[PDB]
């Protein structure tokens with residue numbers, strides 16, 4: 158299983174962790190004219206999950222199961238226990254963490270579902286080394302009070318980081334500088350539009366690299382940049398892979 | 405999903421010095437000329453793309469004038485071009501005529517310069533951003549050891565320095581002609597060496613050349629597609645204070661860059 162531990166922790170190993178995560182998610186990826194790998198689709202369940210271990214400084218480890226179709230967490234296993242999002246694939250119980258005491262969390266793996274139940278948004282939830290550590294702990298013990306926020310932390314710091322090199326860079330700066338941050342409009346607008354960008358970018362094969370609809374990505378000055386084509390370096394040199402949307 | 409096959413999109417096209425592709429005078433008739441003009445909201449800068457590989461303003465298609473290089477680019481009646489394979493726009497922003505291989509080009513930066521069909525050499529004058537947002541994208545450029553490209557020696561050289569938030573000379577403007585420019589002085593462009601003996605990347609006065617055309621690839625390189633090479637840190641050592649042009653290679657991390665905007 159791919160791993161990121163607190164012992165071997167730095168900007169460089171985090172960068173390496175994300176590279177290998179991207180690489181393994183994009184095994185067998187399709188490619189278009191944009192050259193941004195598209196994730197696999199209609200994957201047999203028995204091979205639809207990529208397992209990733211995370212370990213804090215107190216050597217408490219959780220294994221997260223990433224759906225390789227959409228690069229979102231379906232479940233995680235701590236010790237002999239495991240916890241599944243109620244929108245994880247129905248058969249996921251029979252393929253992963255089979256040798257565990259399995260539980261169902263009463264919310265979906267989406268930011269919307271997690272924020273509603275957690276009672277807290279991503280912009281109120283700080284990100285950094287300390288919060289990565291706490292998240293691993295709170296998930297390992299499964300303190301229900303902190304399970305929602307812990308996923309907001311780790312979904313962003315691992316998966317959205319994998320999805321977007323800009324987000325990866327925000328986490329690199331936070332690790333390097335030992336400076337926590339809450340995400341702003343730039344980071345959130347990428348997360349909001351990963352699925353929309355995937356659709357439009359694959360739809361653009363039809364129209365010479367031009368999108369069916371515009372996508373508003375914000376910059377660090379809170380200025381909305383409208384991406385209606387593949388000819389923006391903030392998309393093209395940012396997004397690492399896509400959701401399968403079009404044949 | 406019907407959104408996988410969108411039937412049309414109206415956008416703008418901006419290139420050399422951030423100026424837009426413009427039908428001179430908004431003229432209806434066949435052979436009406438197409439020019440480099442300051443960007444605006446007018447109808448004759450609106451360009452509608454279609455599945456049949458046409459690009460249309462005023463209800464008429466964009467087209468090259470002649471078979472050989474040199475001649476203008478014009479709008480003409482579409483029916484003229486219904487059994488023509490039309491334009492292909494490459495990954496870099498090179499807009500090419502399929503059958504002829506001629507590419508959309510701006511031989512000068514001046515307002516009302518005639519756009520033309522020339523032989524592709526991947527010059528900055530042949531690079532175009534298809535998009536409604538025509539403004540230069542202000543950003544830092546982070547590379548090896550998580551350090552920023554900084555304009556140095558009165559905007560003549562470029563090398564890596566520790567990133568400092570809001571430090572003027574570490575900010576760069578990415579123009580619709582694939583140029584990387586000093587944000588404090590947008591007459592100046594990052595450039596591959598004009599001297600044949602040096603590979604050292606420099607800052608020089610913008611001139612639309614092949615040296616100044618830079619493509620941020622999805623694989624994390626900054627490519628000069630004309631010279632078939634990428635930006636690289638000299639010997640993977642940032643303290644050498646030299647960024648060079650080198651053939652693409654996976655040995656080291658000196659050719660990896662992030663756009664942080």
Ligand SMILES: *[C@@H]1O[C@H](CO)[C@@H](O[C@@H]2O[C@H](CO)[C@@H](O[C@@H]3O[C@H](CO)[C@@H](O)[C@H](O)[C@@H]3O)[C@H](O)[C@H]2NC(C)=O)[C@H](O)[C@H]1NC(C)=O
Nearest residue numbers: 466467468469470471472484485488490491501502503504
């Ligand atoms: C890309 O370039 C090619 C070649 O330069 C263009 O093909 C040319 O298109 C014109 C207009 O359809 C063709 O026109 C007709 O020629 C006859 C005489 O043969 C004339 O009587 C008609 O009034 C009309 O002008 C022309 O033959 C054709 N040339 C070739 C070599 O096929 C094409 O239009 C360009 N495409 C774009 C979108 O720029």
Ligand SMILES: *[C@@H]1O[C@H](CO)[C@@H](O)[C@H](O)[C@H]1NC(C)=O
Nearest residue numbers: 243244263264265266267270
């Ligand atoms: C989770 O997603 C399912 C569809 O897969 C949806 O029916 C359900 O409403 C979502 N969760 C909640 C709490 O709404």
Ligand SMILES: CO[C@H]1O[C@H](CO)[C@H](O)[C@H](O)[C@H]1O
Nearest residue numbers: 426427428429430441446448
């Ligand atoms: C004076 O403006 C008009 O002509 C110029 C060229 O002279 C441009 O085509 C512009 O789009 C049009 O509105």
